[PDB]
């Protein structure tokens, strides 16, 4: 059995989105697949059990990231969103509210419920931050995120584990 999940990686310019996809996709292991799959997204494939795999399409909002509003070809049929901000740039934090409001205005799961949304406070390795952890938690709750965590794509801190718990949630919602 194959479980296919389209995951949106959204957030303002310069927060670390392309770096997250480059680290977490399979592209540092093999890119042979791109010639027939294309490049709208990057893949990651994981064995899930003896008879099941999980396949993730990682969609980077990329060229339209500064518009803070997703287009239909980008968001359609997604199973989750990773909304990234830079802890050192409060504008990217504030704009995560606009990204989340846009997601919920555009997309639900097939059952009509909201898509899971994981808020990543990225660049946690830098100092000082422009927001506090208590501020992030209140913001995550007030805006209806599934949860939040700090990450450093640069130091590979919390990346794999944050994505892993999101996969497990997408499997539960399947
Ligand atoms: N210090 C630090 N730099 C990061 C981190 N993640 C990304 N960067 C850097 O931030 C810059 C922008 O990253 P990029 O992935 O292009 O951001 P995007 O514009 O959201 O795609 C690059 O120089 C990255 O190396 C992080 O966790 N910590
Ligand atoms: Mg980018």
From Swiss-Prot:
Q: So which tissues is this one expressed in?
A: Ubiquitous.
User: Which residues are recorded with the post-translational modification Phosphoserine?
Assistant: 69
Give the record's PTM text: In case of Salmonella enterica serovar Typhimurium (S.typhimurium) infection, is proteolytically cleaved between Gly-38 and Val-39 by the GtgE viral protease encoded on the Gifsy-2 lysogen bacteriophage, which therefore prevents the recruitment of RAB29 to S.typhimurium-containing vacuoles. In contrast, no proteolytically cleavage is detected in S.typhi-infected cells.
Q: What is the effect of changing residue 69 to A?
A: Loss of phosphorylation by LRRK2. Impairs RAB29-stimulated LRRK2 kinase activity on RAB10 and LRRK2. Reduces membrane localization of LRRK2 and impairs RAB29-stimulated LRRK2 kinase activity on RAB10 and LRRK2
Q: Can you supply one Gene Ontology CC term for this chain's record? A: nuclear membrane
Q: Which UniProt keywords apply?
A: Cell membrane, Cytoplasm, Cytoskeleton, Differentiation, Golgi apparatus, GTP-binding, Lipoprotein, Membrane, Nucleotide-binding, Phosphoprotein, Prenylation, Protein transport, Transport, Vacuole
List, in alphabetical order, the GO biological process terms annotated in this UniProt record. Answer: cell differentiation; cellular detoxification; Golgi organization; intracellular protein transport; melanosome organization; mitochondrion organization; modulation by host of viral process; negative regulation of neuron projection development
InterPro entries for this protein: P-loop_NTPase, Rab29/Rab38/Rab32, Small_GTP-bd, Small_GTPase
Q: Where is this motif: Effector region?
A: 33-41
Sites where the protein binds GTP: 30-34, 36, 123, 153-154
Where, per UniProt, does this protein localize?
Cell membrane; Cytoplasm; Cytoplasm, Perinuclear region; Golgi apparatus
Sites annotated Cleavage? 38-39
Effect the entry attributes to changing residue 40 to A = Abolishes interaction with LRRK2 and reduces membrane localization of LRRK2. Impairs RAB29-stimulated LRRK2 kinase activity on RAB10, RAB29 and LRRK2
User: Membrane topology for this entry?
Assistant: Lipid-anchor
| Function text | The small GTPases Rab are key regulators in vesicle trafficking. Essential for maintaining the integrity of the endosome-trans-Golgi network structure. Together with LRRK2, plays a role in the retrograde trafficking pathway for recycling proteins, such as mannose 6 phosphate receptor (M6PR), between lysosomes and the Golgi apparatus in a retromer-dependent manner. Recruits LRRK2 to the Golgi complex and stimulates LRRK2 kinase activity. Stimulates phosphorylation of RAB10 'Thr-73' by LRRK2. Regulates neuronal process morphology in the intact central nervous system (CNS).
| Subunit | Interacts with LRRK2 (via the N-terminus); this interaction is direct and stimulates kinase activity.
The protein depicted here goes by the name Ras-related protein Rab-7L1
Q: What's the source species for this entry?
A: Homo sapiens (Human)
């Amino acid at each position: 059995r194959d479980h296919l999940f389209k995951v949106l990686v959204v957030g303002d310019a310069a927060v670390g989105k392309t770096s997250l996809v480059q680290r977490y996709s399979q592209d540092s292991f093999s890119k042979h697949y791109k010639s027939t799959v294309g490049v709208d997204f990057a893949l990651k494939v994981l064995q899930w059990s003896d008879y099941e795999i999980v396949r993730l399409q990682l969609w980077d909002i990329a060229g339209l990231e500064r518009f803070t509003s997703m287009t239909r070809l980008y968001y359609r049929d997604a199973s989750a969103a990773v909304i990234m901000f830079d802890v050192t740039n409060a504008t990217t934090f504030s704009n995560s509210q606009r990204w989340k409001q846009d997601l919920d205005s555009k997309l639900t799961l097939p059952n009509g419920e909201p898509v899971p949304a994981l808020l990543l406070a990225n660049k946690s390795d830098l100092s000082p931050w422009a927001v506090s952890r208590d501020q992030i938690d209140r913001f995550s709750k007030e805006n209806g995120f599934t949860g939040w965590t700090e990450t450093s794509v640069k130091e590979n801190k919390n990346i794999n584990e944050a994505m892993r718990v999101l996969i497990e949630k997408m499997m539960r919602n399947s």
